Amino acid sequence: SKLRAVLEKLKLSRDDISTAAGMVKGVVDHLLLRLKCDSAFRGVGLLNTGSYYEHVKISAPNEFDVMFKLEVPRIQLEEYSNTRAYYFVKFHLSQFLEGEILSASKMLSKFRKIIKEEINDIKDTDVIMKRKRGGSPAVTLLISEKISVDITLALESKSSWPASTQEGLRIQNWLSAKVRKQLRLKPFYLVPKHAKEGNGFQEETWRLSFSHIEKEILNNHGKSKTCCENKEEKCCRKDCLKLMKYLLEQLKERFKDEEHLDKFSSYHVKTAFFHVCTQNPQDSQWDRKDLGLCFDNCVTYFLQCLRTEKLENYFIPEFNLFSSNLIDKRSKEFLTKQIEYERNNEFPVFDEF
């Protein structure tokens, strides 16, 4: 089929994976070792996240995501202005305090400065730091002009998840209530992405991250524990996510001279995909033989999210990714129009010629 042919072209080369994995591990392990020499980052550890580690990276293994996590004992959180996702952290760490507030901006600034100085000492490999991207909690490196790596500082809390998550992670009918309880016993993370404050931002605030839980779900994604472990249980969940990501990426590439698509991200499709899995919890609703129908249902669900301007964060239901505070109505209408055209014409944006 056409979709199967697209999936074939999206597969990663084993040779590319081998080379990229070696490059990234070498650079990241070095930066970890050097950061641990600083008094403030002594206890840092690594957590691999995002599409490469979820086995849904497409085309080339040229973008990796990692968290450098730090456990801070006796952590106390205060929600910022009923935003549900953003928090003050109250508490060798004195350098980052603003009163009793542990400033996200201050910690990120030193983290970035250390990494920038350390990549300058790496002489056996071309490593540079990309310019700051507003709204990202990550420090982004480019290795050998080819491989991007996002390194996100994170504080780790082993306390119960914040109350704003109480009604999220609605996986009970799909992955089980037992699994939901087990996942909610794991730590959660705070990353230095700041809440909007008018036309500025609250530079002290941090944002909740559950990227490790997203990875565990994607890598253990069936109602059956043996989903995708044998030829009789090959579902099309990840294939549908890959196709949705490629659809969005290709449209963003086409309309790049346009502004209306700049705010859409693969996280929007990832979030919508998790909701589709919640609404279709049986592995038999994702049979490989039904790839075209499954993908079409993912597309129409995403269209409905755009039209209603509703895409709840999977962990924090009152955080609407498609709120008008984040994305203009006209931008959602513009993307709706382009996706409808693709659906109605059997996805010409997928064709090479």
Ligand X SMILES: Nc1ncnc2c1ncn2[C@@H]1O[C@H](COP(=O)(O)OP(=O)(O)NP(=O)(O)O)[C@@H](O)[C@H]1O
Ligand Y SMILES: C[C@H]1c2c([nH]c3c(Cl)c(Cl)ccc23)CCN1C(=O)c1ncc(OCCO)cn1
CA distance 20 to 230: 28
Among 84, 207, 221, 238, binds ligand Y (CB under 6 A): 207
Q: What is the 3-state secondary structure (H, E, C) of 222-245?
A: CCCCCCCCCHHHCECHHHHHHHHH
With tokens 């979030």, the residue in question is 271
Look up residue 159 and give its DSSP letter. Answer: S
- From the list Zn ion, ligand X, ligand Y, none, partner contacted by residue 222 (C-beta under 5 to 8 A by kind): Zn ion
**Closer residue to ligand X (CB): 57 or 112:** 57
Nearest by Cα to 335 from 201, 244, 273, 242 = 244
Check binding of 191 to ligand Y (CB under 6 A): yes
Query: Please, how many CA atoms are within 13 Å of residue 251, restricted to the half-sphere of its CB?
Result: 26
Check binding of 267 to ligand X (CB under 6 A): yes
Check binding of 221 to ligand X (CB under 6 A): no
Stretch that binds Zn ion, among 181-189, 193-201, 218-226, 242-250 (CB under 5 A): 218-226
User: What are residue 77's DSSP bridge partners?
Assistant: 89
Helices (H), 85-186: 104-119, 177-184
Check binding of 63 to Mn ion (CB under 5 A): yes
Annotated binding site for GTP: 49, 150, 207-214
CA distance 147 to 63: 6
User: What are residue 156's DSSP bridge partners?
Assistant: 71, 189
CA distance 264 to 274: 17
Check binding of 150 to Mn ion (CB under 5 A): yes
Strand (E) or helix (H) holding 308: helix 291-308
Residues of span 208-267 touching ligand Y by CB under 6 A: 209, 265
- Residue 215 to residues 106, 270, 339: CA-CA distances in angstroms? 29, 11, 27
Among 137, 162, 192, 222, binds ligand Y (CB under 6 A): 137
Annotated binding site for ATP: 51, 63-65, 211-214, 245, 266-270
Check binding of 50 to Mn ion (CB under 5 A): yes
**Closer residue to ligand X (CB): 182 or 265:** 265
Which phi and psi (to 5°) does residue 79 adopt? -60, 140
- From the list Zn ion, ligand X, Mn ion, none, partner contacted by residue 228 (C-beta under 5 to 8 A by kind): Zn ion
**Binding string, 230-259, against Zn ion, x = CB under 5 A?**
-----x------------------------
**Closer residue to ligand Y (CB): 286 or 315:** 315
Check binding of 291 to Zn ion (CB under 5 A): no
Q: Which residues bind ligand Y (CB under 6 A)?
A: 65, 136-138, 150, 152, 191, 193, 207, 209, 265
Contacts to ligand X by CB under 6 A: 49-51, 57, 63, 65, 150, 209, 211, 214, 265-267, 270
